Write a structure and sequence with these properties.
The structure is cut from a larger assembly and holds 8 copies of chain A. Chain A is built from 5 helices and 21 strands. Chain A is flat, with a radius of gyration of 27 Å. Chain A is mostly beta strands and 343 residues long. Chain A starts with a helix and ends in a 7-residue tail after the last strand. In chain A, helix 2 packs antiparallel against helix 3. In chain A, a hairpin with a 5-residue loop joins strand 17 and strand 18. The relative contact order of chain A is 0.08. Chains E and G meet through helix 2 of E and loops of G. Strand 20 of chain A pairs antiparallel with strand 4 of chain E.
């Protein structure tokens, strides 16, 4: 019976199509479903439920993508994550992802996308400096906030703007955790020359998987960028480790990441049109996995077995035009044992 | 909007004027229409015509593709008449410009039996037939036959398209009555595709011969026409209750 | 990141002077594929070949299902107004004769969901569960099942 | 006697749900909608309270934790609305079984 | 370890960290760091493989165990033309660009839904609403190509063809279309992108076609589009169009809404799933008239009244009418909805069966009253359903089946031949051995 | 008559729980989850409100008792979630007995 | 619907019942009015607040005027309002004597 | 759900049958994590020993 049903499902799916339930049903559709779940129904009731559904649809479909991030070192594979913002005058944000590797001959199948999902963690970003990232292989949201604060103990009370960088991550069950906070007022004032109103402050984030860290850059939008560090005063850096501690980057460390400038937002030369470029995962010259789990195998005649094969550390070095790969602590155990028999 | 052509053969769709602008200079009102476009497609809105005859005219000939812009002879109303079983029925159409016979069918009974198109005016006497065409492959449908001579009168007087007519008797697999006859021309002239506007007492006619943005591909499928901006001098509108 | 043509050329010839094709490897599990071509294919190549074979099998199943669905005599039918004949349907009908129009009623042994099909699948998959030398082989304990 | 019983039960079955039960279910639905209607206002209050409200030579007054309180409030409102909808559906199903 | 063409073997005789105890129990071997000169890797699509094998055999030649693996090495590529970026036009449409390709990101149906919502909801769910145009995706134009039918003399054996673009963004070529040659003409409508400042002054973009006989590029062998100061893309006169049948440009054409784009799910929910769910809920509560009214937004055998005339289309749902597929991997899991999404004809059949169910329920309800008028009404409902269904067919292939042996039916050769024929049909179209010789 | 009664009761027993009851139970579960989800936000608001919010030459403005109020709020939320879960389980058991 | 007027008398059915607005409007005096752009109803008003300029030894106050605009959604709810500052225009056209 | 602990047919890992019998590592290696199981009436404590 079960084999017959499974086989028939392909040829005659209409026998198992249920209008009231479907894999991938959107939340608003369910809300409508409970809105019309009473025993007796009238035309006006169904029309009102449909109007509520229309309200939800209008809210969702007006979203505009504000930030993107590609989880790879090149555009050939990986997943792209988008964060978008509503039209209304509220701080409501949604996120989704797409699989760009499914592209073939220009067009993408509709199933490669993912439905918008709301973010509810009390985000109040400054303008449009909010973006997703993937650090420690789970989704993170990073944004900046602005407050007006006056310095204490000054006879002429003067005020200024304090900028705070906030980072949060998505938990297993879909909830969002409390955000880590850092002070980046000095960096913003340095890269903007104390004119944040006239210049468009921009934020970029990348995930250095090789060293297990998160790189954050704050800069001023422009037509083009030179190499980081040294005399270039337009870019400031920041490094975040796994435990939440931070470290302000110096010139020597800043010059290391000069190749990331190609993933920054720019002003188009032909027509002053703002173009946003999705950030990318960073690597030095080539990306290799940090470890490799060999697995286990069975010997001849079910007599011996190798187990615990593992290479925990793999490093790469690209010097001049030569790439060298170093494997550290390649180990495996051999044991005389049969995988179940009289032997 | 959209409309249905004569005899449920063609249809105009997607007619839309997305931009309409006005300009009142001195005492003259001018109206500009931007991107006046519409698509024309050969299709029937539900009948034997769309199912059979249109698909018959979309088939490729033997002198090389095309079959567009030719003259055709079709039947007014065609109905199943008899036979061993009611298949899709051999629906036949005549191409006068190349003297072709194009026949379509829905299904076939069995591949082993020999099959050939047979056209007789009496449907009973095999020896009274006027047209006989053997299917070069046995298990094929929607073919052309290339009569090769001007036999329009013979086709007109021959009803009862028969899809059987073997050599072991008659064995009429299917038969269809054609009733009336119509002659059509699928060719078009660029001077007959026009937009006419009435503004009070003024009449303006714009033909595609000079106001077309780009003439579409000459094919039986959807053909979209688009027009460059059109100017109308609406200085003679009769305004009643501030609306004309 | 590989090319299926190159791997097929590496595996070819198929003992019959022919180029190996994805259909010939329908057929066997990933472990069997890795074992047979252990000398010529690495891990990644075997994995890619297995994925390609699975994808081809699924595509063929979908194509056959679509062709059968569009040719169901039951929908003839006020819904037939929304049915269009495709080039693929014509090609299939020309190649396989009247197979696509040869529907059968449920409960007949010829149906693909009849117990005959289930038994055929069971015999096809379970025939090679033991080596021919072993006395537990299906063709050894019950020789009549093949007939 | 049996005929009288049949007439009574047939009348009860034909009547089905009277007007009072319909009104009760409509009230529960309206309560769910009204409870849900306050989330946008809560978010607006939270975002508005963050602006400083004292001036002169002693500035400040911003309420730092307004947004988090607003989010907690909207989630509580969603929970209440879900409870009301569950109650309405349960009542309807009980009537059907009866 | 195999890296491209280099092979390195490291034995435990000299690369062992510490030889373990010689015992029948577990013996763990650990190695000092190993160096591999991977300067000969073949990078295709900025990724190359690296193979590692652990081998261990005793003096008897028995293999104590063999483990194989493949490592992936990715090349970092931050070239400006390989970094996807988001842009927004003046019309409000957002598109994400990668290399030459562009993808629509947002939608604008919400703004236009208000006109239909001001009147009754019957205005919202119409084919006219679903046929609304969309703003163009950035800067570019539209084009129409007519592909001639397949002939062996000029096309050559296999019936496959491709269309490539060139001289946009970079000076290389990227595939923009792929398809199979058939026996009839093919009409293809495409959106050709165009950058702000063209690279080649003469020809702003080039499109060419390749097949088996001509798998090259050539010079001036295809439409070369050039854009004037004010729109109006034109074809360069010195361009050979022998391969194509006819190439035309559409200077103002605006494509309608796409039901295969990023927002396909919301379109399908608004236009198909929601009225069906409402109809099902109304039917479950024996509200027949409202259920019919709600299902008429999708299918109605009597046609649809538009502007006072019967509409030419049959199905009110545009994706159903045009049979637009919006799923590429329907068999990844057991899911009837995914299969139906891959081929939306099953949705047509499901809607038809729902309508028949409603009619039969109406008939039964009328029958259960025993009044003569109720009996006549039930008769009318049943007659209408029977007329809609048609006449049922009979068994055809039951007596044509030759009973095979169990070994024969499970033969691997038969399945392999059938699968090969199916693959050749789907991917090619070669008709060698046209008749299948049904005795096999 | 007896056969009709048997058919009716067999159908009712086979049908078991219809869709409305499933929807009601799922709604109660979701309500419990949403109620529980606010504790982290309450704690964050409490810890954020302790920072001073006025400046100039008259500083201060900290809300001293923010943390304790946050703790009271989270405990009330836990109580509400427990009540919702108890209601859901009771309804399920009643259906089983029926 | 004023188009229904016939020789001066309007049928009572051409009117529409009053409907409440619940979006926390606090207009200044009587500067509140409806409008229709983007073909849906909008409510636009102005508000007045008392604000002092920071960083001035003699603390002087003034009136800040804010223009607020909101629109009516499908299900009858009102959206959050857009806000703009029009203090300079008000002071210019009124000559600082509001 | 129970196949994550015990499965008579074995467990497929990397496309091959795994050599172990029990999927739960402490059960497979028989690791004892309780030294005083008889201090009170408790079947779980004894099983843990």
């Amino acid at each position: 019976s079960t084999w017959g049903g499974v086989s028939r499902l392909v040829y005659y799916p209409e026998n198992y199509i249920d209008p009231t339930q479907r894999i991938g049903q959107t939340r608003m559709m369910d809300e409508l479903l409970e809105n019309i779940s009473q025993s007796k129904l009238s035309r006006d009731t169904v029309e009102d439920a449909f109007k509520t559904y229309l309200t939800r649809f209008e809210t969702v479909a007006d979203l505009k993508v504000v930030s993107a991030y590609h989880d790879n070192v090149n555009s050939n594979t990986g997943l792209t994550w988008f964060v978008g913002q509503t039209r209304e005058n509220l701080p409501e944000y949604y996120w989704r992802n797409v699989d760009i590797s499914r592209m073939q001959a220009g067009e993408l199948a509709a199933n490669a996308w993912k439905e918008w999902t709301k973010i509810d963690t009390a985000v109040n970003p400054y303008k449009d400096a909010i973006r997703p990232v993937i650090f420690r292989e789970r989704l993170h949201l990073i944004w900046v906030e602005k407050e007006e604060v006056a310095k204490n103990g000054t006879d002429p009370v003067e005020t200024y703007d304090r900028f705070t960088l906030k980072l949060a991550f998505l938990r297993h069950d879909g909830s969002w955790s409390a955000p880590w906070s850092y002070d980046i007022t000095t960096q913003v004032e340095a890269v903007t020359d104390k004119k944040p109103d006239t210049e468009r402050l921009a934020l970029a984030a990348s995930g250095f998987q090789g060293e297990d860290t998160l790189l954050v850059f704050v800069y001023k939008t422009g037509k083009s960028y030179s190499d980081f560090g040294g005399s270039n005063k337009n870019v400031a850096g920041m490094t975040i480790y796994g435990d939440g501690s931070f470290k302000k980057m110096e010139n020597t460390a800043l010059s290391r990441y000069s190749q990331l400038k190609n993933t920054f937002d720019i002003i188009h030369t032909q027509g002053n049109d703002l173009v946003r470029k999705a950030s990318y995962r960073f690597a030095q010259d080539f990306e290799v996995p940090a470890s490799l789990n060999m697995g286990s195998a069975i010997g001849d005649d079910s007599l011996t077995v190798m187990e615990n094969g593992n290479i925990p550390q793999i490093t790469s070095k690209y010097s001049s035009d030569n790439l060298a790969i170093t494997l550290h602590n390649a180990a495996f155990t051999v044991r005389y044992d049969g995988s179940g028999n009289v032997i | 909007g959209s409309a249905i052509g004569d005899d449920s053969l063609t249809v105009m769709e997607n007619g839309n004027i997305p931009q309409i602008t006005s300009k009142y200079s001195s005492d003259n009102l001018a109206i500009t229409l931007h991107n006046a476009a519409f698509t024309v497609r050969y299709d029937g809105s539900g009948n034997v015509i769309r199912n059979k005859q249109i698909s018959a005219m979309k088939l490729t000939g033997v002198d090389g593709k095309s079959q567009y812009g030719n003259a055709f002879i079709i039947a007014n109303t065609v109905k199943h008449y008899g036979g061993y079983s009611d298949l899709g029925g051999p629906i036949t159409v005549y191409n006068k410009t190349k003297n072709y016979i194009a026949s379509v069918q829905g299904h076939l009974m069995n591949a082993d039996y020999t099959r050939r198109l047979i056209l007789t005016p009496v449907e009973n006497n095999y020896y009274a037939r006027l047209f006989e065409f053997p299917f070069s492959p046995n298990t094929i449908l929607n073919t052309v036959f290339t009569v090769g001579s001007n036999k329009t009168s013979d086709f007109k007087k021959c009803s009862y398209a028969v899809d059987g007519n073997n050599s072991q008797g008659f064995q009429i697999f299917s038969s269809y009555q054609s009733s009336g006859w119509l002659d059509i021309d699928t060719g078009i002239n660029n001077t007959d595709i026009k937009i006419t506007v009435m503004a009070g007492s003024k009449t303006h006619t714009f033909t595609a011969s000079d106001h077309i943005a780009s003439l579409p591909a000459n094919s039986f499928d959807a053909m979209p026409y688009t027009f460059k901006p059109l100017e109308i001098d609406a200085s003679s509108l009769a305004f009643t209750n501030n609306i004309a | 990141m590989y090319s299926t043509a190159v791997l097929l050329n590496k595996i070819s010839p198929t003992r019959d002077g022919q180029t190996m094709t994805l259909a010939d490897l329908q057929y066997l599990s990933f472990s069997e594929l890795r074992k047979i071509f252990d000398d010529q294919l690495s891990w990644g190549e075997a994995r890619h070949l297995y994925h390609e074979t699975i994808e081809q099998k699924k595509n063929n199943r979908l194509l056959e299902a679509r062709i059968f669905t569009r040719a169901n005599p039951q929908l003839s039918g006020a819904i037939r107004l929304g049915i269009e004949r495709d080039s693929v349907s014509r090609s299939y009908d020309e190649m396989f004769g009247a197979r696509s129009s040869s529907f059968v009623k449920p409960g007949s042994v010829a149906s693909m969901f009849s117990p005959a099909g289930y038994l055929t699948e069971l015999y096809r998959e379970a025939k090679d569960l033991h080596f021919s030398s072993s006395a537990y082989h299906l063709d050894n304990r019950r020789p009549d099942l093949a007939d | 006697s049996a005929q009288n019983r049949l007439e009574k039960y047939q009348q009860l079955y034909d009547e089905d749900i009277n007007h009072g039960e319909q009104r009760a279910m409509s009230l529960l639905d309206a309560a769910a909608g009204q409870s849900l209607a306050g989330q946008v206002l809560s978010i607006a209050e939270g975002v508005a309270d963050l602006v400083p409200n004292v001036f002169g030579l002693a500035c400040g007054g911003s309420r730092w934790g307004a947004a988090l309180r607003a989010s907690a409030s909207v989630m509580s409102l969603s929970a209440t609305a879900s409870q009301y909808s569950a109650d309405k559906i349960s009542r309807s199903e009980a009537y059907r079984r009866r | 370890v195999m890296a491209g063409s280099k092979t390195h073997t490291f034995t435990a005789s000299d690369h062992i960290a510490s030889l373990p105890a010689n015992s029948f129990d577990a013996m763990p071997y650990t190695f000092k760091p190993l160096e591999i000169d991977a300067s000969s890797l073949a990078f295709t699509n900025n990724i190359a493989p690296l193979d590692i094998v652990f081998e261990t055999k005793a003096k008897d030649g028995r293999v104590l165990g063999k483990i194989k693996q493949t490592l992936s090495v990715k090349r970092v590529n931050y070239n400006p033309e390989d970094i996807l970026f988001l842009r927004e036009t003046h019309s409000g449409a957002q598109y994400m660009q990668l290399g030459v390709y562009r993808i629509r990101l947002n939608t604008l149906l919400a703004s236009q839904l208000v006109s239909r919502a001001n009147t009754g909801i019957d205005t919202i769910l119409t084919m006219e609403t679903q046929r609304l145009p969309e703003p163009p995706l950035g800067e570019g134009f539209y084009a129409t190509f007519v592909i001639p039918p397949y002939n062996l003399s000029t096309h050559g054996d296999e019936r496959w063809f491709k269309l490539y673009i060139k001289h946009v963004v970079d000076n290389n070529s990227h595939i923009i279309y792929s398809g199979q040659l058939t026996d009839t003409n093919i009409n293809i409508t495409l959106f050709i992108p165009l950058d702000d400042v063209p690279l080649n002054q003469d020809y702003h973009a080039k499109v060419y076609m390749t097949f088996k006989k001509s798998p090259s590029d050539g010079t001036w062998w295809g439409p070369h589009f050039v854009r004037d100061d004010k729109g109006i893309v034109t074809i360069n006169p010195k361009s050979i169009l022998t391969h194509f049948e006819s190439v035309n440009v559409l200077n103002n054409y605006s494509a309608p809404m796409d039901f295969n784009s990023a927002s396909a799910l919301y379109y399908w929910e608004l236009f198909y799933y929601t009225p069906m769910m409402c109809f099902q809920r109304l039917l479950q509560e024996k509200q027949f008239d409202e259920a019919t009214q709600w299902i008429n937004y999708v299918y109605n055998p009597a046609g649809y009244i538009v502007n006072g005339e019967i509409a030419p289309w049959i199905w009110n749902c545009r994706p159903l009418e045009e049979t637009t597929s919006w799923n590429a991997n329907p068999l990844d899991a057991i899911d009837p909805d995914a299969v139906a999404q891959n081929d939306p004809m099953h949705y047509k059949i499901a809607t038809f069966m729902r309508l028949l169910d409603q009619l039969i329920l109406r008939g039964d309800m009328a029958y259960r009253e025993l009044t003569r008028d109720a009996l006549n009404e039930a008769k009318m409902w049943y007659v209408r359903t029977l007329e809609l269904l048609g006449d049922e067919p009979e068994d055809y292939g039951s007596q044509q089946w030759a009973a095979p042996s169990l070994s024969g039916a499970a033969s691997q050769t038969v399945q392999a031949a059938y699968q090969q024929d199916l693959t050749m049909l789907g991917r090619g179209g070669v008709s060698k051995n046209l008749r299948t010789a049904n005795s096999l």
